[PDB]
Amino acid sequence: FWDLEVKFTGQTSLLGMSEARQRGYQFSSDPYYLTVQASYSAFGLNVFNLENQRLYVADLRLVSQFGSPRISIDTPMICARDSPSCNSTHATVLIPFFGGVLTGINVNSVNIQLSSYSLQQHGITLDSRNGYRLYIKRSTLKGDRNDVLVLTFIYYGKTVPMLISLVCS
Amino acid sequence: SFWDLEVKFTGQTSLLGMSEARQRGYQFSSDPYYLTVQASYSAFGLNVFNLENQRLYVADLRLVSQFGSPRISIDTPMICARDSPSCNSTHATVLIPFFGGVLTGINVNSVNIQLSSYSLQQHGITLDSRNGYRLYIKRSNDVLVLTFIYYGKTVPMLISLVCS
């Protein structure tokens, strides 16, 4: 099958399916996808923090137990669980500096050039002093439960798109 | 370039783009059911061993994707006794030098001998393993597969049993 190798606190550990399922991971097979899911209580998660918004990062890899075609699949997870925080006019997404370089922004299937003018036109302001601080104009949104943000990072050699709903909670 | 070819050579690793690898002697073909990686014997980063006029070519290859979230890495090592077998009379000989790989399985014509009710001797194969693997196959189409455990990878090496 596949085993889960977890990079945690600098060490590499291999986890069987049973251990991972007990410790907060789920593995499901689709006719089209292999699906890996992690609960925020799962083992080996690293929890960064920017203000009151939490970013959970898991550096995960799927390693085949069948060594003849030895296959290794990096499946890193980067999630700002508590994002966004909203106020009267702006929804704020706060990403701490965690090893990921913000390389792309997508709002409702629209990729936004990182030009300051393009971001401002799209109602987005980006602060880079202490982590990435996104303040997103609520007007440009398209209602509630209808808006998605994909922040793409380059995380330790892997391009990781993080999909979050921009709902105020 | 979907995939990059990682070659381990002289204790170092060189990552090669698809076009560079093709330049340096590799070929890549895609089927609906298989990915195909081919290496000519002149390809870059091949390790060549010699025992007795028979050469073992070892490539420590790994395809490494340039993709995004799924950075998949597949070890595709290749081991080939190019010159085997040497036939004189009543013996076809296959010679494998000690190269760090562990001989774990011998398969002659879709007959796995480790899982067979008959012995190697009953299959007509004589194995000498003091100074490399020497297989003595009585002469009196057919293919032989030698399976190796090499650095944690299982590498079946298929050769035809024709007389060179």
């Binding site: 899911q37 992690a38 997870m77 798109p161 999909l163 | 698809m18 895609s30 990915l35 979230s69 998949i72």
Partner: peptide
């Protein structure tokens, strides 16, 4: 190819067929 972030879980779905060469 995308990490799905809800309030309770992080979910990634990986295609089961490898991409060809050319």
């Amino acid at each position: 190819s995308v990490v799905t972030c809800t309030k309770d879980s992080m979910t990634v779905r990986i295609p089961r067929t490898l991409s060809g060469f050319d």
